[model samples]
Target: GHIYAVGGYDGTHLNSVEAYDPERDEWHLVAPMNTRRSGVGVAVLNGHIYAVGGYDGSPDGTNHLNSVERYDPERDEWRLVAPMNTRRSGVGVAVLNGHIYAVGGYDGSPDGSTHLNSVEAYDPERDEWHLVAPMNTRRSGVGVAVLNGHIYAVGGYDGSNHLNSVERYDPERDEWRLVAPMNTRRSGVGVAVLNGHIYAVGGYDGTHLNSVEAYDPERDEWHLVAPMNTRRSGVGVAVLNGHIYAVGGYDGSTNHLNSVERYDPERDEWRLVAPMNTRRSGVGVAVL
Candidate 1:
């Protein structure tokens, strides 16, 4: 399997894309996105990669995008798709069943004072978007994942403060329910699901944090795990070969970081991995 590093910031917004081959332990540049975006949402559906809304680095804040695009791995190309109804940055995206869902993010015209609670779903076959019941709380930089046929929206900033609130949505009921909150309030956390559990990784809680937590839906509980070696926020996380890889993020001391690390659940330990060539925060990663 290959891991993809998508749109993110270095100094300015970026549209460039890269792919990492575990077999080669190397990263190679891939097709660039149509728009420069940081804090974008990404997901793989039916083998195609989808890059969703994000910040465009406009000082005026008018450039937060509703734009969406899909990359065909087979063709090695990127193409625009139907945009979302609302502009967003720092959004959370997840795929359940056959549709893609875009959740809470920052929506602003000047300042990012507007944190959004809006949710929308896209039908690939129809190439159309439909509004869905919004989340119970407004948040940006939230962590989202799908497990047991339900979508979970995790900790994030709500314009005012970091939050520990966690909510779950049942598409069949088109409703959200509050779940066991995380032990720490956080934003920009990296989240992924593996072994029937949700793992929440490094994030910011007033400061960069290396704390990690695992949620067991079967027991409706959150348990602390071995902390990561490095503190980070806006990290990209994914599970592959039974290990959780936590990629690029901001570390307070270094705003943009290229360092990478992985956690082996069996050993309950984290170890350093090869670093990315470019430092980036608000990056998107997918194992292909």
Candidate 2:
């Protein structure tokens, strides 16, 4: 039900797109994306896939990108879409009420400066981009989801520190509101929607963390969940069928990792999945 696309390590960005069949507990190779970039965000609407904003592998470190590619799984083809107004890396993306939203990220540098707060919406039917109001805070590594017709951008790092703040964006009003901050301040976290709640999983807080947090919109509160087996960052999360799977990320000490962890909210636990084919950081996952 969900597909995970992972980038390669060791100087080459991966074009490999791996899909998971949760009902069978299996992984299959799909048509690779047109570009090989890391830190990309992906979303699917009406059976079409959009992969947005990542860095091209270069000696310069993470170079922000604005290129958008449209993928057709049924036909096994990829094409260029409307480019985002801003070129960025470490970006967060989501689709809400028929509009695909590409949210906050950094441009220009990694440890370098220039984190951004820009939010833009794309209408596939019209194939155009309309810039929205900037976020209250500029952040990279945040997670975004649409709930009850509102887009929630949660948890990330600004320039100096990891953040716990959660902001809600109203497309109709073109405004952002600070609702609640996360219990733990972290970046490179995994976020997913399951059983009517939003789950934020393992990430780095200056030091790596395995802690998990969940947000309930109705209550406006965040509750803690079971920690991950391995501490990681730049992990990719998605709900396949019913279970939540967290994929590859970099552990603080050893660089990137291939370990896979799955969470079952009904059981309140995590278990191992087949390791990813490659080690990567800053990958995104989407389901069809």
Candidate 3:
């Protein structure tokens, strides 16, 4: 198994990617993405890692890319897949019902800051992306994860300000329903599920937040948990080896960073883990 850090921003957009090997406690550079990306959404499904919408700052290409790609571990190479219909940056992605879901994000209209609520699902068999039911609120920089056969969309930015609201998508009905809101408003929060509990970590909520929280589905409530020691925004998060790992983000000091932290639910504590090889925020995270 490996944890991946895909296309992110340092000062400029990046196409580079890297992987971490916990067994050796080392990270190694891997093949770069075909397109430079920031605010990318990543997920794993069907023996491959899928990277969807993001900001691709190409002088000649679209800034908010609808294009998508996937990585094959056996070949150690990435290739383009069917692109989404809408360009999206700061998108949140997850795998549910054997399909990849790309949720809310900005529409690349820098002037309007057109945050979007539109949703799309990718069917590997058809190799196509199809429009799905949208969320009630427009959101960009959102966090998404799959739990209990449902897809949860967490805190994010609405064109106005950060949101404390949350929603869940029921694929069976192709609908989204409101859920308990998080206490702290978050945008660009790194989210993951561990032992059925969903964790929402570092993100900006009017300000960069180091604090994190846990949401219990059965209780339908959110509770404060050990937060990351380092403040980060636009960070990438993934659950690996039963631990939630937060990696690569803007530290709100103009330093897009490489530092990483791990949360151990068993001990109710967070650990400062090995740093990444390159500084990056808006990084895409995935474990396989």
Best by lDDT: 3
Predicted structure 2, TM vs. truth: 0.93
lDDT of each residue in 1-288, candidate 3, tens digit only: 889999889868888899998888778998888888899999999889888989978677578888999998889899999999888899999999899999999996555447989999999999999999999989899999999999899989986489989999999898999999999999999999999999999899887889899999998999989878889999999999999999989888447989888899999888887888989999999998
Positional deviation of residue 220's Cα in model 1 after best superposition, in angstroms: 1.0
Task: Give the residue spans of candidate 1 off by over 4 A.
Answer: 58-62, 110-113
- In model 2, what is the error at residue 168, expressed in angstroms? 0.6
The TM-score, computed over Cα atoms with residue i paired to residue i, of candidate 3 is: 0.97
**Reference-based TM-score, model 1:** 0.96
lDDT of 2 at 112: 45
lDDT per model vs. reference:
0.88, 0.80, 0.90
User: For model 2, what is the alpha-carbon lDDT of residue 20?
Assistant: 73
Clashing pairs in 2: 8-14, 164-182
Q: Which stretches of candidate 2 lie over 4 Å from their true place?
A: 6-11, 59-62, 109-113
Evaluated at residue 250, the lDDT of candidate 2 is: 76
User: Native-vs-model 1 lDDT?
Assistant: 0.88
* Tens-digit lDDT string for candidate 2 (1-288): 666664434226766777777667667778887777687888888888788888878565436788888788889877888888887677788998887999887777444447888889899998888899889988788888777778888888787578899899988899999988899887778788888888888877867878889999889999999988888788888888688888877778567777788998888999998876667677778887
